[PDB]
Structure formats: structure tokens, C-alpha cells
Design an enzyme around this catalytic site. Structure first.
Site, PDB file in Angstrom:
ATOM      1  N   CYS A   1      14.846 -12.535   8.767  1.00 40.94           N
ATOM      2  CA  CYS A   1      13.563 -12.594   8.175  1.00 40.94           C
ATOM      3  C   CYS A   1      13.510 -14.069   7.131  1.00 40.94           C
ATOM      4  CB  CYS A   1      13.134 -11.452   7.707  1.00 40.94           C
ATOM      5  SG  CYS A   1      11.982 -11.744   6.003  1.00 40.94           S
TER       6      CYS A   1
ATOM      7  N   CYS B   1      12.601 -13.473   3.584  1.00 41.76           N
ATOM      8  CA  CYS B   1      13.784 -12.571   2.997  1.00 41.76           C
ATOM      9  C   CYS B   1      15.072 -13.571   2.587  1.00 41.76           C
ATOM     10  CB  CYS B   1      14.111 -11.543   4.086  1.00 41.76           C
ATOM     11  SG  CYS B   1      12.999 -10.504   4.484  1.00 41.76           S
TER      12      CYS B   1
END
Ligand code: COM
Length: 107
Positions: free
Chosen positions: A34, A37
Site C-alpha cells: 500500500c 501506508c
């Protein structure tokens, strides 16, 4: 020298929440693939050093699919905030400003 604890199971999660005692807990629900992230992860780790009285946990949603479902994580990163095992705040998105403001509001 991060203070972030990697959570690897639902059991580890429950026990981390209890081990916190009365301290604010902030949990980053994240994934290795991600982009947002990856962007915020080092900032979450630096905050763990800045706020030594707050407990910082990372939950990988692919590792802890059970924790992710139960905590109703819809997108990553999601940040949930607990006191004595109880959710006291939450928001979604790699938002550095909001992450720090929420820690300061809730600690
Ligand atoms: S965030 C939800 C965790 S648990 O209540 O399922 O333990």
C-alpha cells in the site's frame, strides 16, 4: 529505534491492548503493498519515539485478516485509538497532520 510493536495475531492484539494499562494506544492498520501506508510508516515510527507515553501498534492486514475484519478496516492506512481496550477515536488515510492532532486530542 522504533517503539512500534508489530502485531501478528488476534491474540497478540488483545493482549497488547491490555498490556497498555491506562495509556493511549494508536494502531496503524497497514499493508506492505500500500503506497500511502509506505509513505506514512516512517512518520508513525518517529511519533512512537516522540510520544513515549503513548503505545504504538502496527497491524498488517494481510497477516491479521481477522483483526482487520473485526476492527472493520475498509482501507489502509487506518488509525484506531484505544484506552483500556476501548476505541476512543478513528480515521482513515495517510494523514500526518490528522494523526498527530488525534494523538494530542486523546492523550
Ligand atoms: S478493533 C476490534 C478488536 S476486537 O473487539 O475484535 O478484539
Amino acid at each position: 529505534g522504533t517503539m512500534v510493536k508489530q502485531i501478528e495475531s488476534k491474540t497478540a492484539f488483545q493482549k497488547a491492548l491490555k498490556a497498555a494499562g491506562d495509556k493511549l494506544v494508536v494502531v496503524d492498520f497497514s499493508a506492505t503493498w500500500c503506497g500511502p501506508c509506505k509513505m506514512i510508516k516512517p512518520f508513525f515510527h518517529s511519533l512512537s519515539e516522540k510520544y513515549s507515553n503513548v503505545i504504538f501498534l502496527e497491524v498488517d492486514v494481510d497477516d491479521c485478516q481477522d483483526v482487520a475484519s473485526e476492527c472493520e478496516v475498509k482501507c489502509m492506512p487506518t488509525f484506531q485509538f484505544f484506552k483500556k481496550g476501548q476505541k476512543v477515536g478513528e480515521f482513515s488515510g495517510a494523514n500526518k497532520k490528522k494523526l498527530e492532532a488525534t494523538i494530542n486530542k486523546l492523550v
